[PDB]
Symmetry: none
Subunit: 220 residues, 6 copies
C-alpha cells in the first residue's frame, strides 16, 4: 500500500505480514458475519489491486464465497468496460493509457503500472474502485450466509427479550434489503412477535415507545 | 484520527489495524464492563467521527446494545439541532459552515468536512461532542447490563467481607446515581447488609468510619 | 528484499525476521494448502534469489517436497541454459555478463551479482524468474498433496450443496488442468455430480447457471 | 504522557494503547505485589493527571482497593487544600491560577489546565504529586493485601534458609514501618527466627552478619 | 549490527531485543536441526562480532555444542593466523591495522575497532569471516546431533513411502558429505531400502527415475 | 534510555513496556542462569540509573538475590565514594557537580540530573558504571545459584557422556572462579571422571585429544 513521506509524496510499500495475518485470522475466527466489511475496509486502505488480490486469494476455505466474490467482480468489470470503452492508437506522452475492467481488477497488469495510475496527475483511484467492488461482493456474501429470513422470527415462551432482539437485529443487519424498509420492519415486526405478557406490556406504551423503554418494560 | 505532525501541522492519519484489533478483543474478552468506557475513551483520542463509526461497527454481537447506542446518538443529535439551529445560505470562502447533528454523527459528513471542522481555527469540537454522545450511550448500556440491583446486594453467612465489599462496590459503580446519593448509600446500605458477625464489628467501630478501618477490622 | 527509498536510490535490505517467522509459521501450521503459494508470493516481493533460497531453506520437514522443488528448479535452469546461449571472454566494464541458469538459481552467484543484475539498464528480472520457478515447484507440490481427484467428487445424501461446492472448488483450485479445460469442468461436473434433488432443481434452472442462483435455488 | 520533541517543544501525546494493555495485564495477572508499584511508576512517566485517572479507571475488579485509593487521594487533597490557601479574583494573563487540591487531583479540571501547569515558568508539577498520592494509596493497598505479618515468620524444620529469607524479605518489602525500624528488624529477627542449627551457625558467625556470608554459612 | 543510514553513512545500531528473543525461541523449540544455520544467517545479517558473541552467549543449555563451536572458532583463528601473518609496528593514521586471528572473534577487539574495520574503504570482511566460522561450527554440531546414520534408514513393512522418504531425506540433509557423493548415495539407497512391493514398483519405473515419478508410483 | 536523532544529538526517552515485559519474563521463566547477564546487558543499553532501578525493583520473587545485588551495589558505591571524594563549595557555571557514590545508583537524584550527566561535555557514563556494578552483582547471584561444586562431578555408569559434559560445562560456566584455572580444569577434571570403558577410550588418544574426537570416541 502507498504511504506518504515527510515531504508529502507517496511511493509503493510492501504489504505488511501483520495485515495479512490479522485478515486471515479474522476471516477464520469470525467467519462471514456483518463485521468483516468494516475491518476489510480498514485493513487495506490505499492497497493496490495486487494487494487486494492477495488478501482474497489468501483466504483458505469458504471457496464458494470466494467464487461468488470473483463472479461479482467479473460482472462489475464487464459493466465498467461496457460503460467506459478504451481508446486505441498512440497514447500521449504525459498521460498513461486508461485501464480496462480486467486491468482495473488488477489481473493482467504489473504493480508498477498500478503505482503509476495511483500516483498520476491527476491520480486515478483504481484501488478505491476495486475496493468498492470487493465490498459489494462481501455484502452479497454476508447476504448469502444469512441463516434465517426476517419474517420467520418468533420469540419462544422462555427465550428472553434480549436474546430475541439480538437475533432480530443480527439477521436484520445481515438482510440489508434497504434502509426505509428496515425502519418499517423495526417498527412493525419487532413488536408484532413478542411473548403475550411482555407483548401487552409493550402495547401498553403504544407505537410511540422507543427501544429503551421497550426493553426496560420486559426487564425485571 | 488526526495527530500533531512535525512540524505543527495536523494531517489525517487513518486508524491503525492494531487499535481496531485491541478494541475488538476488549469487547470480546470484557463484554460490557464499567471500565470499557475509559478504555474506549483512551483508544480513540482525537478520533474523527468516521473512526468512531468504524470502532462501533467492528463490534461483534451485542446488537441490541449497539441499537440503543445508535438511538441515543440520534436523540442527542436531535437535541443539538433543537438547541443549535443551522442557518441556510452560501458559505464563506475561508470559514466552514456550522455542522448539524447528522454532520456530527458522521452520517452525511464526508471525511474532508470533518478534517476541516477539526483543523480550522477556531476548531469545531465535533470529535469531543460525538465522544460525549457515545459515552452517554455506553453508560446507558453498562447500567442496563447490571445483573442485579444495588439494593439486593447482601452478604452470605460465611461469605468473607472481602468479596462482599468487592461485589457491592462493583454493582454500585455499574449503578447510576448522583454522587451525593452514592455518599448516602455507602453509609446507609453497606454496613446494614453485612454479615451479623462482622456487622457487630463494623458497628463497634462507628458510623462515620472509613472503608480501610472496617476492612482491617473484619480482616480474617 | 529491495525496498525503494523515497525519491531516492533503491536500497538493499535483509529479509525481516518477522517475514521469515511468518513464513515458517504458515508452512508449519497449514502444511501445503493451495493458499500457501499466494501467501508466499505476497511475503516474498522484490526479493533476491538469496532471499528466496533462505526462505526455502528455513522450511523444516517435508523434505520430499523440498527435494521435488529443487529438482523442478534444476529442470527449469537446465531448460533455460539449453535455450539461452552463454557468452564468455572479456566483458566491457559497466555491463554485467550473461546470467547463467545456475546463477539465476542463486547456487553459483553472490548477492553482489544478483543486485547488479537487478539494477542493470534494462533490468533483468532474475528474482521474478526464480520466483516463477519456485511457484511452478510449489504448484507441483500442492498437486501432489491433493487427497482426492476432481473427477471422483460425489455429494453425500445429507451433505449440503454448500459443503459440496466448497469441496469441489477446493479440489478445482488444487487441480492441474489448463484454464480452458478448467472452465468446462466447473460448468458441467458441478451440476452433473450433485444429489438428485438439487440436480433436477438446477436442470429446471437450465442454462446460464451461475453459482449465486444455483445456491439460492438449492436452499432448504 | 508528555514526550519532549528532539530540539523542540514538549508536545503532548495521548497514552498509547500498549501502556494501558500492559497495565491491565499486570494488574490482572499479578494481583497487587510490592513490585507492581515500581512497574506502575515506570509505565506512567511524565503523565498528566488525566492519564493517571485513565490508568486507574481501567482497572477491573478489586473495587475495595480502588475505593481505598480514592479515599486516600481525597484525604491528600483535603490536606493540601488545608495547608495551602487558594487565591481568587481577577488573575493576570499569562499566569495560571492557584491549583486546588480537588484540581490537583484532576477531578475538577480539563487537560488544558494540567498542560499549562506542567509548562509554566517555573514549572509546577501536578503529575509528580498526583503520582505520589497514588503511590501512597497503592502502598496502603499492598500493606493491606499482605497475608502474614513480619513478626510472625518462622522457618520450617525442613524448609531451607533460602526460602525462609525469600519469604522474610518479601514480607519486609510489604512492611509499613519506617526505614530505621526496617533496618533493625532485618538485622535482628532474621537470625533471631531461623532454624536452631543454622541459628547457632549464624551466632558463631557473630556480628557484622552480611546476607551472602549467612547464605554461604547455612549451605548444606 | 551496522546498517545503511540515510544518507549513505553506516552507523552502529545495537542489536534489537526482539531479534535476541527470536533467536532464543528458535534455539528453544527448533533446538539443533538443519534449518537453524539458515535462520541464524538471516537473523544476524551484517552483524559485528560482538553481536554474534551476544547471540551465542544467550543460548541456554547445550553447553557441549557451544564448547565445540568455541573450539572450532579457535581452530579457525589459529589457521587464519598461520595463513595471514600480521606484521607488528606503528599503524598508519589513515588506514587501520590488519586484524589478527583473535580480532575476528571479538575477544580482544573493541567495538570501535570492528566498526572501523567494517566501514573503512576498503572494508575488512570480519563479520562474514566470523559468520563462516560459526557456520562451520554449526554444521559440525548439526552433523553430530544426527540420531542415526544414513545407512541405517530403512522403511517399515506398512510405513508409507511418504514418511520413509521424508525421514531419509531429512537424515541425508543432516548428514555431512559432498553433493557428488550424495548423487550416488540417493540412487543406491532410496530404492533399495523401500518396502518389497514398493521396491518392485519403483524398479518398474527405471533406475534413473525422478523423485516425483517414484512418488506418484506408490501414491496411496 | 537515550536515543540518537537525525541531527545526531540524544535526549531522554520513556522506557518501552516491551523491554520491561521481556526482562520480567526472562527473569521468571529462566530464573537465574549464566545466560541472564548477556540478556540484561542487551536489554538496557544506554539506560539511565532510574531505568536500571526500575528493571531491578520490577523483579518479583527471588528477593534474596535482589538483596544480594543491592548489598553489592552498596559496597561498590561506598568504594567509589572512598576513591573519589566530591568537592565542596560553589560549582562552575559551565560544569555540573560530579555525582557521589550513592547518586551513581540514582537513589537520591532526579532523572533530569542523570540526563545532564550522560549528555554533558564531556559525557559522564553513570549508566555504564551502574550497569557494571549490576553485572557484577548478577555474577555473584549466578555464583550462589550454582547447584553443585566443580569437584563433585562424577559420571554415572549409564549417564551418557553428552549429559556428563553438558552438566560439567554448565556448572563450570556457573563457577567463574577464573579463566586459566578453567583451562586447567577442562584438561584434568574432564578426563579424570569418565566411565571406565569410555575412560580408557579417551586415554587411547592421549592428552593431545580435542573435545570433538573426545566425544566421537565414546559416540556410537
Amino acid at each position: 500500500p502507498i504511504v506518504q513521506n515527510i515531504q508529502g509524496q507517496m511511493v509503493h510499500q510492501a504489504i505488511s505480514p501483520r495485515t495479512l495475518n490479522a485478515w486471515v485470522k479474522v476471516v477464520e475466527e469470525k467467519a462471514f458475519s456483518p463485521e468483516v466489511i468494516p475491518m476489510f475496509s480498514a485493513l487495506s486502505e490505499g492497497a493496490t489491486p495486487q494487494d487486494l488480490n492477495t488478501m482474497l486469494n489468501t483466504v483458505g476455505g469458504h471457496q464458494a464465497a470466494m467464487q461468488m466474490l470473483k463472479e461479482t467482480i467479473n460482472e462489475e468489470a464487464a459493466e465498467w468496460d461496457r460503460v467506459h470503452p478504451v481508446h486505441a492508437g498512440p497514447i500521449a506522452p504525459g498521460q498513461m493509457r486508461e485501464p480496462r475492467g480486467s486491468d482495473i481488477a488488477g489481473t493482467t497488469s504489473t504493480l508498477q503500472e498500478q503505482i503509476g495510475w495511483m500516483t498520476n496527475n491527476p491520480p486515478i483511484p483504481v484501488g478505491e474502485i476495486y475496493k468498492r467492488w470487493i465490498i459489494l461482493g462481501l455484502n452479497k456474501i454476508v447476504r448469502m450466509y444469512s441463516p434465517t429470513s426476517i419474517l420467520d422470527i418468533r420469540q419462544g415462551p422462555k427465550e428472553p427479550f434480549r436474546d430475541y432482539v439480538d437475533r432480530f437485529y443480527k439477521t436484520l443487519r445481515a438482510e440489508q434489503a434497504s434502509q426505509e424498509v428496515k425502519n418499517w420492519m423495526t417498527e412493525t415486526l419487532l413488536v408484532q412477535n413478542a411473548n403475550p405478557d411482555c407483548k401487552t406490556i409493550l402495547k401498553a406504551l403504544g407505537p410511540a415507545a422507543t427501544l429503551e423503554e421497550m426493553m426496560t418494560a420486559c426487564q425485571g
